[PDB]
Design a protein around this ligand. Structure first.
Ligand code: HEM
Length: 386
């Protein structure tokens, strides 16, 4: 029934926010919790900028953030995202679709003799890492390297002298990743393959193109945005199914519900539950006037429990309609990979139900939750096969 969430994620413990907007004196930032406010904010990029680092001293060199459109505003955002969407071709997308079943089955074969395991480590996490890697065109040998990379990034996210300390740590890993992708981009310029790096290298739009530094930073962004949130979606869903057994029977009796189940999992336990914005001018949100050049955190996780928007918000309802949650954001930064996340997670859940029909969450070994402030979800999920 009840679990051990990040201490900041009060909405997961059923608490309504005391105020729609408030200010954190210690961290010197603003929080927004309401759904219609969060939605208006995300829809208003010209006052609520995604260029958060302009507030944060010290700044990464331009070559390091070059092309990362998740932190860019229009008009440059429109151009960068345009080139990357062009490179996400219908061919590449269908290729991932045609592969997803075989990869799921291969993973599940690797635990066919185990009675107890961690669903995250054995399945929910490797599946989207393998899919995003395959998309980008990475050899099989290198996906261990990606695992190590993400592990490093999570350890830091969980954890002027110390201002420079953290700087070195972050840069040394981005250097390594950038150098990896530059080599891929260079190879694919000479001999293009059937993958996203090759499409990013040849993408041309009116009639702009990307250089290898931009391409490398884009690949890094897709990598970090891709797999861990998808892993949490899959694992959070199986956890919810385990805890709400009526919904479990409901879904097993009606496999048509799985797409709506995943959307309800998105809403109820949001893998990304907060996104950062910076204000360009003075604004009034709800009642509160927020000053210029302020960091604002938009808590999509909390907004997804807002009763002004959702009837019975703290009920998990596997067939919930309507369900316009903010799990993938809203507006111009609307999650670029959401169809891929939905495709992967649907296939994972469908096959889990069929192949491990007596699967249950390990009662002797409770789930651990990711202790990262802006992600709500399972870090480990011990399960038993019988
Ligand atoms: C359950 C899975 C996922 C969740 C919950 C998720 C969530 C989000 C959210 C909330 C945003 C918007 C952030 C903001 O407004 O500041 C976003 C953006 C993005 N996501 Fe996802 N995402 C998921 C999967 C993926 C996947 C699989 C990919 C790539 C293959 C991906 C790539 C991106 C990219 C590139 C953006 C940036 C779009 C932009 O700024 O224009 N995401 N995602």
């Amino acid at each position: 029934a009840q679990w051990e969430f990040h201490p900041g994620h009060f909405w997961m413990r059923g608490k309504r926010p005391d105020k729609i907007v408030d200010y954190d004196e210690e961290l010197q930032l603003w929080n927004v919790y309401g759904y219609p406010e969060s939605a208006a904010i995300l829809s208003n990029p010209k006052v609520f900028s995604s260029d958060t680092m302009r507030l944060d001293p010290i700044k990464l060199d331009e070559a390091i953030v070059e092309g990362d459109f998740a932190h860019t505003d229009p008009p440059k955002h429109r151009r960068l995202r345009g080139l990357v969407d062009h490179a996400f071709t219908p061919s590449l997308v269908a290729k991932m679709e045609s592969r997803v079943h075989g990869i799921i089955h291969e993973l599940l074969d690797g635990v066919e003799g185990k009675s107890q395991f961690d669903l995250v480590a054995e399945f929910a996490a490797p599946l989207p890492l393998i899919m995003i890697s395959d998309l980008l065109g990475v050899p099989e040998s290198d996906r261990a390297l990606f695992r190590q990379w993400m592990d490093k990034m999570l350890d830091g996210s969980e954890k002027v002298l110390e201002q420079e300390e953290e700087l070195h740590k972050e840069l040394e890993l981005l250097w390594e990743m950038r150098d990896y992708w530059h080599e891929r981009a260079a190879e694919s310029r000479k001999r293009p393959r059937e993958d996203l790096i090759s499409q990013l290298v040849h993408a041309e739009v009116d009639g702009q193109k990307l250089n290898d530094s931009q391409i490398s930073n884009i690949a890094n962004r897709l990598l970090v945005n891709g797999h861990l949130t998808t892993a949490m979606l899959i694992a959070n869903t199986m956890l919810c199914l385990d805890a709400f057994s009526d919904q479990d029977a409901r879904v097993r009796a009606d496999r048509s519900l799985v797409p709506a189940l995943l959307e309800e999992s998105m809403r109820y336990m949001s893998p990304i539950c907060g996104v950062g914005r910076a204000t360009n001018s003075e604004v009034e949100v709800a009642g509160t006037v927020i000053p210029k050049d302020q960091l604002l955190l938009v808590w999509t996780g909390a907004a997804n429990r807002d009763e002004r928007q959702f009837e019975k918000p703290d009920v998990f309802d596997a067939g919930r309609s309507p369900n316009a949650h903010l799990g993938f954001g809203r507006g111009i930064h609307f999650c670029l990979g959401r169809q891929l996340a939905r495709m992967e997670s649907k296939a994972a859940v469908e096959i889990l139900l069929d192949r491990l029909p007596t699967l249950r969450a390990d009662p002797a070994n409770p789930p651990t939750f990711l202790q990262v402030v802006d992600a709500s979800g399972v870090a480990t999920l011990p399960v038993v096969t019988q």
